[PDB]
Design a protein around this nucleic acid. Structure first.
Lengths: 59, 73
DNA sequence: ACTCTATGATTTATGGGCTG
DNA sequence: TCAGCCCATAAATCATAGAG
């Protein structure tokens, strides 16, 4: 179990922070992000889940 | 390490997590392989047998299916 | 060389919409 | 009807890949 590539994280973080007002990508958006990042939509969901929580946690 | 959002958005507001024992988990896992779904009765007898409530058993099975749905198996 | 932190996944639990 | 199902998500917690 390795970590996501450097480009995948930049892409997810960019999407995330660009949508700070509502970090809830649709099913399609999750699929497009997954395609570009080269992972599963499920990993995208986990990724947003952890990001969303860990973020509000450090506010 | 602290986050400084330019603005506090709604999703950013709020909305200990007990762990199940080897026995509880093992048994539940054991039951689920007998039938991925539970009857109001079976649900009650299993809840009493594991010191867990009915709700917790219902939910444990709900989550168990999502996991079963996932992993396509 | 070696220690922790941040990271990806998994485990309990909530709520809403939908159908037998 | 309405108890129970699915689905998406919360939040805490497990495990360990690597940045320090």
């Amino acid at each position: 179990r390795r970590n996501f590539s450097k480009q995948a994280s930049e892409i997810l973080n960019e999407y995330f922070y660009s949508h700070l007002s509502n970090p809830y990508p649709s099913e399609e958006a999750k699929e497009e992000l997954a395609r570009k990042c080269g992972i599963t939509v499920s990993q995208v969901s986990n990724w947003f889940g952890n990001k969303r929580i860990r973020y509000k946690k450090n506010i | 390490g602290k986050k400084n959002p330019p603005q506090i958005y709604p999703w950013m507001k709020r909305v200990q997590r007990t762990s199940y024992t080897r026995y509880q988990t093992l048994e539940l896992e054991k039951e689920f392989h007998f039938n991925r779904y539970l009857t109001r009765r079976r649900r009650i007898e299993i809840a009493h047998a594991l010191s867990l409530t009915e709700r917790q058993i219902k939910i444990w099975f709900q989550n168990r299916r999502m996991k079963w749905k996932k992993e396509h198996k």
